Amino acid sequence: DILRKIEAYKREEIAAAKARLALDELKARTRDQSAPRGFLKALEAKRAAGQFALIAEIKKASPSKGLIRPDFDPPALAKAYEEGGAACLSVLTDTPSFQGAPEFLTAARQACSLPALRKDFLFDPYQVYEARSWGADCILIIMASVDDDLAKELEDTAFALGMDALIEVHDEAEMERALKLSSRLLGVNNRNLRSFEVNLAVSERLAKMAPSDRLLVGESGIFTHEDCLRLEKSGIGTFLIGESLMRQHDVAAATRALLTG
Template sequence: MVLKLEKMNILDKIIERKKQETAEAESKISVEKLKDSEFFGRPTFSLKETIRTKSGIITEFKRKSPSKGIINNKVSPLDVVSQYEKFGASAVSVLTDEDFFGGSFDDILSVRNHINIPILRKDFMIDEYQFYEAKSIGADVILLIAACLSPTQVSEFTDLAHSLDLEVLLEIHSEEELKHINKDIDFVGINNRNLKDFKVDLQHAADLKNQLPGNILSIAESGIYHEEDFRFLKEKGFDGFLMGEYFMKNENPGEKFGEFVSNVEI
């Protein structure tokens, strides 16, 4: 039985819409046509490399979210991500979901030729077609959200991403989702914010990190609101940090990032 949207949590609503959106996109542009795009054949940048050689912070361009509403819709992607790179970001995450996060493919396309760090296409990946989209717009890394996928899907999507020379960040939030991890995943991100109720718990993420395979790179995601939060998670051994709202809620996100990097002495 199909649930009515009003009875779904926000993640269910997003996935339902994403299925419709992807079907519509594929009916208009075939995979073969995506392969003809300007960026499909470009060599990708490696987050595995930049997470070690730069700040370890994956900055983010995000206009709004279901939990916070409008965060910042007055700045351009190029202005922001250029400064992110200038001040040492290891990568930039760009939201491409339009309905819930105010993003678009243009947010990646408009910056791809202007920065030399990896771009993470941050979206809700539920269909093979989306991986070809990601490659065609110049992404280097894709996000897989365990809450949206089965372990088998994670494995299959990881293989597909790697065949397209895209790295994979798997996001988990619960101990149950540890089973989604496989040996080919490039990074495991632990979301400090529960996608179903948006509660934040940094200690929960730290505890969950201790249960990860020892050879996998770990990323702390979301809910990092203060320099103290960053220091706490760094002390817990996280290799990287995905931060969006902390910078985007400022009038000049790039300058705020530069100030943050200076204060935490990366």
Template sequence: MDILNKIIIDKKREVTLKKSIIPTSQLEASVLFNGRTNSMSKLLRNSLSGIIAEHKRRSPSKLVINNIHSVEDVVLGYQNSGACGISVLTDGKYFGGSLDDLLLAKASVTIPLLRKEFIVDDYQLLEAKAHGADAILLIAAVLTREEIKHLSEFAQSLALEVLLEVHNQEDLEKSIMPSLDMIGVNNRNLKNFEVSLNYSKELANQIPNDFVKVSESGISSVEAVKELQKYGYQGFLIGEHFMKTDNPGREASDFINKTIVC
């Protein structure tokens, strides 16, 4: 069994357990649940850099990336760097994240927040809204077209934007629908963790311009961003490159400044 399938099996079990403890009514009663959300897609369309900076402690492929810096320090550094938005990993078992990380990020910054999670159930969208997310990630590889449609439309009803992640043409063909805001191409194969920017380049022309094009993972240089911009990408999700440094915010600032002036 590959790691992605293992994560999804564990995630479905986790969601079932959470549902038995915290009812949806409790999530809907959250102070943040009826708050206004900020549009990440609009900021990306109007940005010169398009950087979505990620808070990420560890991953199955890299193990520990950064367990030193607090959520508050990292996300404030990202906001001050000029990032368009922040991706917050909330998976605990494989990435060391939590919904508390999302809540702390919400309390610390004003730019849009993406809940980066393996979403398989409506319940997780209610969690996202109750903890301050402005956007959510859906991964085409683990969802059917019907599930993508249902979850993306439910997200829209909660005023959450949707970033739909694809990895190949099959993912893309089954996923394109009006209830999406952004389509991201993951340059990392989630089954074997190989990374190549060619995944983004090969799919670029097949993504309609109605959606903001986002390239995810494996981006570690300004040159890569500039190259992908030529293919119509307006968003660039970068986490490990920033998080593995002593000062993620400063690294993001240097990166963004070079992206804008180059």
């Protein structure tokens, strides 16, 4: 049935042709960006100074909870987070679930001097080029979403473009898989993806399993300076937090409070 056989390969050629020209355009755009700001290196400098290292997150909406902050202004939020002592930014660029946008990353980053992470669901190295073209200094790899080959390819592409990679893990199997990669940034996430239950004990347990050369980033269920001090006892001194800070009026003051008490 020669027509069905031709159609099947022809559709693959068409997909490959589009991907090729798109990647060529993104390559041009990455060569016209200035160098990455050094996302990991910023966090390590905070920890070397004996301070908590915050990745401060700009998130417009939550699936479940709706619009986070009535007035949503990525550049103003970036400035307020820098003022309050944030070491780096996380900007949601996913639209259907979080009402982020690629342009929010670029605008937030231009408004301050902090390195910035593209916070989104990556399944394809094409998206790592995207991130760099938008100015990203770091990408996100989610171990629950991608297999080992794809994680390595995502991380290798990020390194080839001068960016860091935050590896998000939720359990022991994911942690063991994450330790096959090179990246030092490991995100230990307290929110169960099956149940949506949130418990700080999850990061405490995963941290015991990590070697000391990895920089652990605590995510979810972190609200107060005291939460940070607790997690610090398990070796976690870097955090990714957004919503709870965003839903307070004075974002700079909320950030200082969380970091310093």
